[PDB]
Design a protein around this ligand. Structure first.
Ligand SMILES: COc1ccc2[nH]cc(CCN)c2c1
Ligand SMILES: [Ca+2]
Length: 223
């Protein structure tokens, strides 16, 4: 997260870190046994880390639970990042509390202008590299479909939205991948892609979760 703020320990209780020996992606806890992330975060050997603030220090609220199964969206296209969503089933249910909590799926798609919270442990610079150890937060609005399509001609599908600032300076970045965009207490987006981070006229692009609720619910019910 470039141009954000330090969230504060366990203020974003649905945020997960996907760990394969190191943090490599975020995700969101949607019930005691399931995480949603980005399909581009797929790999085998995932441990889900819940209750994290500092990803390098054991602070006492963590739960470390191995993935049993990963399900990439059947229509995920790694070239276009259309359908950039994946579900991860935990080996055992998480213990839910004020610091480890699920985030509700949306019943409705959020409109342009809605303010959202984006969180992650990604890079905090738009040029060069500095990785924070504690969770960073950014408040950003959903942009109009027309602004989003004007910024990324020929690349925005109906399964994507833009959020952020056309001015630049505030955005999700490398290592924020898979993390949540929460608007009005519902999961509306997944950190998916962009052209660099925090560049002028290049907002972040997010998976439009409201289009996937039926797939999520059906998949969870049968796995
Ligand atoms: C440094 O460039 C990258 C590299 C990989 C990335 N994944 C997701 C994003 C978000 C951009 N908002 C991103 C940016
Ligand atoms: Ca920790």
């Amino acid at each position: 997260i470039v141009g954000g703020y330090t969230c504060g320990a366990n203020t974003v209780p649905y945020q997960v870190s996907l760990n394969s020996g190191y943090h490599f992606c975020g995700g969101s806890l949607i019930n005691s046994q399931w995480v949603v992330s980005a399909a581009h975060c797929y790999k085998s050997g995932i441990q889900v880390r819940l209750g994290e603030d500092n990803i390098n220090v054991v602070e006492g609220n963590e739960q470390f639970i191995s993935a049993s199964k990963s399900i990439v969206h059947p229509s995920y296209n790694s070239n276009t990042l259309n359908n950039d969503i994946m579900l991860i089933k935990l080996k055992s249910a998480a213990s839910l509390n004020s610091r480890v909590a699920s985030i509700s799926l949306p019943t409705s798609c959020a409109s342009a202008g809605t303010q959202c919270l984006i969180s992650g442990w990604g890079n905090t610079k738009s040029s060069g590299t500095s990785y924070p150890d504690v969770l960073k937060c950014l408040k950003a609005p959903i942009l109009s479909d027309s602004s989003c399509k004007s910024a990324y001609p020929g690349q925005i599908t109906s399964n994507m939205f833009c959020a952020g600032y056309l001015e630049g300076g505030k955005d999700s970045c490398q290592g924020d991948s898979g993390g949540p965009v929460v608007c009005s207490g519902k999961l509306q987006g997944i950190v998916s892609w962009g052209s660099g981070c925090a560049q002028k006229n290049k907002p972040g692009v997010y998976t439009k979760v409201c289009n996937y609720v039926s797939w999520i619910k059906q998949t969870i019910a049968s796995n």
